[model samples]
Target: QARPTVIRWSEGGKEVFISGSFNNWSTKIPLIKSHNDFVAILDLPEGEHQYKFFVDGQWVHDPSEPVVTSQLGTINNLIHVK
Candidate 1:
């Protein structure tokens, strides 16, 4: 079995939540707060996933990561679970 993937985002606000198409974009999963960032460890299969952050009531992207335009005309951060 493959190890889990650890995703992280910097400058997360007071309330930091993560949502993605992998989770049906319904549930808001919280991240572990670090000194200057938030991180989450996920056991995902091999594929690409689209995700975004909900911080302090705002939907934000991972500025440090690559982004792609979705079919909905909205942009989302891309994560490849390889």
Candidate 2:
């Protein structure tokens, strides 16, 4: 079974969505906003995946995690499932 991990971003008063390679990089998964943050629990397989948040319309990296440079010379936030 894949273990669930909670990814969070501390930004309030905005509609947020998450996209990643796991979901083809175009699927818009909604996030739950609470207090001063947004969070989503994802069940990713055991490996590293790239992801970013869509805050309203802007793409933003996870400020709480390390980043990796893609082959396209763009940056994406990375998370590992173990």
Model 1: per-residue lDDT, tens digit, 1-82? 5458887878757878888878779798888888888888877667888998998899889888989898888889998877
Give the clash count for each candidate. Answer: 0, 0
The numbered model that scores best in lDDT is: 1
| CA error at residue 8 for candidate 1, angstroms | 0.9
TM-score, model 1 to reference: 0.89
Candidate 1, residue 6: lDDT: 86
lDDT of 1: 0.84
> For model 1, where is the 10-residue window of minimal lDDT?
1-10
- After superposition on all CA atoms, what RMSD does each candidate show versus the true structure? 1.5, 1.4
TM-score between model 2 and native: 0.87
RMSD of 1: 1.5
lDDT of each: 0.84, 0.83
